[PDB]
Amino acid sequence: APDQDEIQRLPGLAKQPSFRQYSGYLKGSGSKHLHYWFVESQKDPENSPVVLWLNGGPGCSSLDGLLTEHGPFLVQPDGVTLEYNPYSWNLIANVLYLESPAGVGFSYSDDKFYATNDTEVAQSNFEALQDFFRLFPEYKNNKLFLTGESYAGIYIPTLAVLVMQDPSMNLQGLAVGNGLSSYEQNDNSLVYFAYYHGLLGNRLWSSLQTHCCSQNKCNFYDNKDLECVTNLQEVARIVGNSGLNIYNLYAPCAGGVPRMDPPCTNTTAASTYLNNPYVRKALNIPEQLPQWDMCNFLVNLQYRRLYRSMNSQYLKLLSSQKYQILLYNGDVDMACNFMGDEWFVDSLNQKMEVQRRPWLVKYGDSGEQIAGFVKEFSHIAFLTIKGAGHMVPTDKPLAAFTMFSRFLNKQPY
Amino acid sequence: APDQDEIQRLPGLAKQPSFRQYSGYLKGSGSKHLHYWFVESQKDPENSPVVLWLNGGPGCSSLDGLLTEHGPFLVQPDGVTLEYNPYSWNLIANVLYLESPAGVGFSYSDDKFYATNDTEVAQSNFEALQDFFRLFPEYKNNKLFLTGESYAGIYIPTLAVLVMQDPSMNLQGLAVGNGLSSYEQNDNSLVYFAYYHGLLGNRLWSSLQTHCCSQNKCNFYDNKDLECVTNLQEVARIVGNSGLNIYNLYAPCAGGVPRMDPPCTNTTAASTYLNNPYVRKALNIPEQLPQWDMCNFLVNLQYRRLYRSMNSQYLKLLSSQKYQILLYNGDVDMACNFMGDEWFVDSLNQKMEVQRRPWLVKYGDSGEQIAGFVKEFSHIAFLTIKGAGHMVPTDKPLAAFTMFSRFLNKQPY
Ligand SMILES: *[C@@H]1O[C@H](CO)[C@@H](O[C@@H]2O[C@H](CO)[C@@H](O[C@@H]3O[C@H](CO)[C@@H](O)[C@H](O)[C@@H]3O)[C@H](O)[C@H]2NC(C)=O)[C@H](O)[C@H]1NC(C)=O
Ligand SMILES: *[C@@H]1O[C@H](CO)[C@@H](O)[C@H](O)[C@H]1NC(C)=O
Ligand SMILES: *[C@@H]1O[C@H](CO)[C@@H](O)[C@H](O)[C@H]1NC(C)=O
Numbered sequence: 034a035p036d037q038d039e040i041q042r043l044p045g046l047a048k049q050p051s052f053r054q055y056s057g058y059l060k061g062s063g064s065k066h067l068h069y070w071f072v073e074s075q076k077d078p079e080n081s082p083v084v085l086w087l088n089g090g091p092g093c094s095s096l097d098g099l100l101t102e103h104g105p106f107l108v109q110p111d112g113v114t115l116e117y118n119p120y121s122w123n124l125i126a127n128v129l130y131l132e133s134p135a136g137v138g139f140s141y142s143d144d145k146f147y148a149t150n151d152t153e154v155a156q157s158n159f160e161a162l163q164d165f166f167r168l169f170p171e172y173k174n175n176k177l178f179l180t181g182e183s184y185a186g187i188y189i190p191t192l193a194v195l196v197m198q199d200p201s202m203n204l205q206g207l208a209v210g211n212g213l214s215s216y217e218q219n220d221n222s223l224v225y226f227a228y229y230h231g232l233l234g235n236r237l238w239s240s241l242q243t244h245c246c247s248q249n250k251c252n253f254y255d256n257k258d259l260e261c262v263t264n265l266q267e268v269a270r271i272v273g274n275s276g277l278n279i280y281n282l283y284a285p286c287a288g289g290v291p292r293m294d295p296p297c298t299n300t301t302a303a304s305t306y307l308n309n310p311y312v313r314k315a316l317n318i319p320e321q322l323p324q325w326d327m328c329n330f331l332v333n334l335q336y337r338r339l340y341r342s343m344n345s346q347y348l349k350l351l352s353s354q355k356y357q358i359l360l361y362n363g364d365v366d367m368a369c370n371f372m373g374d375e376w377f378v379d380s381l382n383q384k385m386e387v388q389r390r391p392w393l394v395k396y397g398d399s400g401e402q403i404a405g406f407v408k409e410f411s412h413i414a415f416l417t418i419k420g421a422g423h424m425v426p427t428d429k430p431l432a433a434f435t436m437f438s439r440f441l442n443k444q445p446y
Numbered sequence: 447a448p449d450q451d452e453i454q455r456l457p458g459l460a461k462q463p464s465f466r467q468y469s470g471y472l473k474g475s476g477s478k479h480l481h482y483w484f485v486e487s488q489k490d491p492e493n494s495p496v497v498l499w500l501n502g503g504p505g506c507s508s509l510d511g512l513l514t515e516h517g518p519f520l521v522q523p524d525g526v527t528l529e530y531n532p533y534s535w536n537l538i539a540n541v542l543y544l545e546s547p548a549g550v551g552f553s554y555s556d557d558k559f560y561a562t563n564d565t566e567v568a569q570s571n572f573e574a575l576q577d578f579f580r581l582f583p584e585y586k587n588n589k590l591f592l593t594g595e596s597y598a599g600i601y602i603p604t605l606a607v608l609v610m611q612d613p614s615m616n617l618q619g620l621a622v623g624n625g626l627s628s629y630e631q632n633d634n635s636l637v638y639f640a641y642y643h644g645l646l647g648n649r650l651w652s653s654l655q656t657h658c659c660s661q662n663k664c665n666f667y668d669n670k671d672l673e674c675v676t677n678l679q680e681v682a683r684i685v686g687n688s689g690l691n692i693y694n695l696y697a698p699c700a701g702g703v704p705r706m707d708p709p710c711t712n713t714t715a716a717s718t719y720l721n722n723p724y725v726r727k728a729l730n731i732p733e734q735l736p737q738w739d740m741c742n743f744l745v746n747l748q749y750r751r752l753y754r755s756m757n758s759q760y761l762k763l764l765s766s767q768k769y770q771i772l773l774y775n776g777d778v779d780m781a782c783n784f785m786g787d788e789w790f791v792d793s794l795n796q797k798m799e800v801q802r803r804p805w806l807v808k809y810g811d812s813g814e815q816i817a818g819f820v821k822e823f824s825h826i827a828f829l830t831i832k833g834a835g836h837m838v839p840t841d842k843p844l845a846a847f848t849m850f851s852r853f854l855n856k857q858p859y
């Protein structure tokens with residue numbers, strides 16, 4: 034452990050943490066330096082696993098994960114106070130929140146050139162993970178899981194493949210929340226999603242069927258029919274550009290119906306907090322670096338997407354059969370809808386183990402409830418979180434914790 | 447107005463109502479006596495319309511409507527306290543909550559034979575509505591709307607037809623909330639609903655398609671294929687009999703995962719309240735009558751369903767073109783899912799007026815949001831309430847009030 038990176042007194046806590054936590058920089062490729070925030074397991078660091086958490090974007094910060102999803106403490110609406118999180122993932126794991134790629138959040142490079150792409154980011158994370166274990170050698174033995182959300186449906190499998198090549202790293206599994214596993218399935222499934230969740234109506238549905246579909250299959254992905262395109266554009270407008278919350282259809286859109294924030298998302302609370310000069314100091318952030326933003330428009334705008342589907346990577350990770358994989362999805366998200374990923378998993382053709390069923394969670398007073406549905410294969414499970422959006426741990430923390438706990442512990446969901 | 451039916455001091459109110467309200471009995475057919483509860487418009491009774499509200503079941507009470515949906519005051523969880531409702535429908539209307547048919551709630555008959563059927567109940571309500579105006583002649587001029595929910599998708603159109611025959615009654619429109627308009631469309635649409643809301647998965651979806659569907663038109667209604675039936679039974683088990691809240695999919699099922707209550711519904715609050723001997727007294731209920739239940743198992747179990755579709759009744763009501771009709775649906779309800787009714791309306795073939803679009807509601811701080819979608823035809827509109835279940839005014843009161851206000855006032859939604 035690099036002592037100088039230790040986080041001493043973090044502004045906004047009434048009482049200091051019982052666990053150690055570090056914040057500093059990991060070397061990536063070239064002259065890139067990725068900011069990390071490592072929170073030790075609240076229960077036996079030396080025998081709790083090592084979890085990498087990557088938010089997606091591309092261009093968005095993994096400190097959103099920490100501060101608004103499943104970190105030990107969550108920033109409150111005043112931008113100043115942090116409250117402990119009883120459902121935090123670092124209850125049972127050493128969680129490494131990594132701001133990536135270069136330029137996102139407090140991460141930078143010496144040359145400041147932040148145009149990048151999937152292969153480069155994969156390599157960058159891989160090398161940063163390498164640099165991590167040089168700095169934290171006492172965690173080289175620990176079980177190592179790679180987890181992410183959103184565009185990290187690309188970051189994570191591509192990374193995992195590189196990790197798979199290095200047996201010094203003790204990779205045991207990976208989990209992806211509302212991930213982007215396949216643009217084609219995402220896009221085709223979203224359109225059904227839109228109709229059957231009441232956003233489209235029958236004239237438009239008919240048109241779509243007529244122009245984009247022939248008898249038992251639709252192409253809403255790359256269809257060249259010009260009348261299909263005009264309708265897909267209408268769907269794109271309804272879903273993404275007309276007032277709905279694409280991250281969570283049944284939630285209000287932050288700041289009425291019409292720097293890069295994610296859409297329908299208020300990022301004030303976290304930004305206010307992390308730009309506090311005392312917070313930057315506590316987190317060993319060098320002063321000269323620009324303000325923190327949840328996402329970087331430059332990164333996102335300059336980003337080159339190469340992989341169109343994670344089918345290879347997953348089969349390549351499944352062939353070995355050393356690795357326990359989970360894809361989970363909020364079933365009211367339209368950014369990466371649950372069905373797209375259910376189709377994606379189903380189309381991996383693995384040996385079915387447990388048939389598709391409910392899975393439960395115990396609540397105070399409410400008793401046991403259905404948290405979602407789960408379909409298991411050997412080494413790979415798909416699972417939904419009923420009534421949760423793009424950011425599962427925010428919409429349903431307890432369910433998210435249960436899922437995660439049962440994942441870490443090789444247990445049935 | 448029958449003075450003796452006036453409600454004087456209602457237990458559980460801190461301060462007494464600014465409006466008059468009456469509770470007593472209307473004569474139906476034979477020796478049947480229906481309990482009513484009439485709440486005068488809070489704003490100019492003499493020029494506010496007359497709204498009949500019927501809950502469905504069959505066998506369930508319209509006092510649920512009052513006490514848990516859109517009455518001037520709602521019973522609170524202690525079963526004792528009533529709190530005023532700022533979104534109450536009697537803000538702008540004279541709302542007549544009618545317990546029907548005979549045997550439901552405080553309604554009875556001298557002979558106590560409560561087996562009945564759609565045609566008899568229709569006639570019974572019609573005659574009770576007649577008896578109403580004998581008792582309340584000063585309201586014969588007022589605009590008269592027939593509104594209901596649930597199985598009242600049958601009660602209301604069938605009733606309306608009888609009302610349509612009597613020009614002494616000033617019928618102006620009717621509205622049905624998550625109504626049962628057509629068993630066939632309800633049943634076929636529910637199955638799609640189930641799949642695309644993540645309850646079914648692909649093996650079961652495939653089977654269903656295979657056995658229940660040829661060439662992309664499905665029969666999930668009355669299909670005789672024995673392999674189809676085995677799967678429809680599975681669907682029935684998942685949707686209705688496995689822990690989900692059929693009234694609202696994203697809500698927990700009251701009292702964990704397993705007298706006729708509705709399923710997944712706690713009826714304690716209201717029952718506790720209405721069985722209070724002092725409440726019965728305040729509401730002029732004769733003592734000898736049995737306890738109040740939100741639904742009557744006898745009625746429901748002995749009920750004979752005759753109409754299989756309200757297509758006739760609605761065209762018959764539309765032909766005249768004196769009548770303004772609204773079907774609205776909570777888009778997370780599985781008892782009477784929104785699509786079934788959207789299909790039902792679309793298949794009425796009326797002259798399209800306004801194309802399908804969003805409709806908005808202003809919230810405190812949140813600004814304008816999308817409350818749902820609306821598709822208007824000549825004299826008949828279909829409209830959804832996003833994120834609302836079977837009981838719209840409970841899940842989304844403000845949106846429900848807005849909708850209703852805009853309905854009453856012949857205004858665009
Ligand atoms: C995704 O980005 C990576 C990293 O930038 C790209 O790989 C890099 O490709 C560039 C040019 O496209 C190479 O630049 C060369 O540098 C070497 C230095 O020895 C020199 O021989 C040339 O003069 C040139 O400047 C760079 O070597 C190369 N890096 C790696 C690790 O392969 C990759 O091509 C991008 N992929 C796509 C599809 O755009
Ligand atoms: C965003 O959050 C900040 C503080 O958390 C608050 O002051 C502001 O009003 C919020 N904006 C919206 C649209 O909720
Ligand atoms: C039903 O409601 C009552 C009164 O609100 C409450 O005390 C009780 O916990 C509820 N019962 C169940 C089984 O949830």
Ligand SMILES: *[C@@H]1O[C@H](CO)[C@@H](O)[C@H](O)[C@H]1NC(C)=O
Nearest residue numbers: 562563564565566567750752
């Ligand atoms: C419905 O009820 C009425 C009144 O009791 C009765 O005359 C009629 O025969 C019933 N209809 C059917 C189909 O049984």
